[PDB]
Amino acid sequence: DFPNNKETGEALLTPVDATASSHDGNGPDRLIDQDLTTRWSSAGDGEWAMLDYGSVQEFDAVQASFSKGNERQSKFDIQVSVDGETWTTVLENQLSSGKAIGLERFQFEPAVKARYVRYVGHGNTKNGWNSVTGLAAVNCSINACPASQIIT
Ligand code: NA
């Protein structure tokens, strides 16, 4: 329902750091490697993974791909922050499609200011695991927001 999305745009920004509240060895670096075969995994409600973009940027969406994303739905919020201390929730009570392993986009408007973007997990529809294979913040005004990342 965002009709101004485009199929091409500028390169996605590269985070300067990716961190997490915890993980099982499958660390948050595996969010940012453009590889569906690697994941961040952390069990429990409220565990998080955070991307630091190094400076304040504007974003109106995330794209995320989910472990076993064709078998179960992941539950999550997205928060952002200018300073890394005060957080704003931009997406709440999100649910992945449960219908694909590739990138899915979760978009809002308008774009907001953020240096730091974080995925706050609430497990999945089968169990408490937060297991994500890819995460990136995006700005649909300047980056591609492909129709193929709307799953249904
Ligand atoms: Na990965």
Distance from Cα 41 to the centre of ligand 1, integer Å: 10
- Is residue 134 within 8 A of residue 36, CB to CB? The reply is yes
Measured in Å, residue 23 CA sits from the centre of ligand 1 at 14
Q: Which two tokens stand for residue 55?
A: 């400076």
Q: Where are the domains of the chain?
A: 1-152
Question: Are the C-beta atoms of 82 and 27 separated by less than 8 Å?
Answer: no
- Ligand 1 centroid, distance to 34 Cα (angstroms): 6
DSSP string, 84-148: SSS-EEEEEEEE--SS-SS-EEEEEEEEEEEEEEEEEEEEESSSSEEEEEEEEEE-TTTS---GG
Distance 4 CA to ligand 1 centre (A): 29
Closest C-alpha among 127, 114, 75 to residue 97 = 75
Cα–ligand 1 centroid distance for 12 (angstroms): 16
Quick count: other Cβ atoms within 10 Å of Cβ 122? Answer: 17
Centre of ligand 1 to C-alpha 61, Å, is 19
For residues 82 and 34, what is the distance between their CA atoms, to the nearest angstrom? 25
29 CA distance to ligand 1 centroid (A)? Answer: 8
- The CA 65 to ligand 1 mean position distance, Å, reads 8
- Could you tell me if 44 and 70 are in contact, meaning their C-beta atoms sit under 8 angstroms apart? no
Angle, CA of 44, 40 and 35, to the nearest 5°:
150
Q: Which method resolved this structure?
A: X-ray
Query: Residue 147: phi, psi to the nearest 5?
Result: -60, -25
Distance CA 101, CA 76 (A): 16
Residue 97 alpha carbon to ligand 1 centre in Å: 18
Q: Which two tokens stand for residue 99?
A: 């219908």
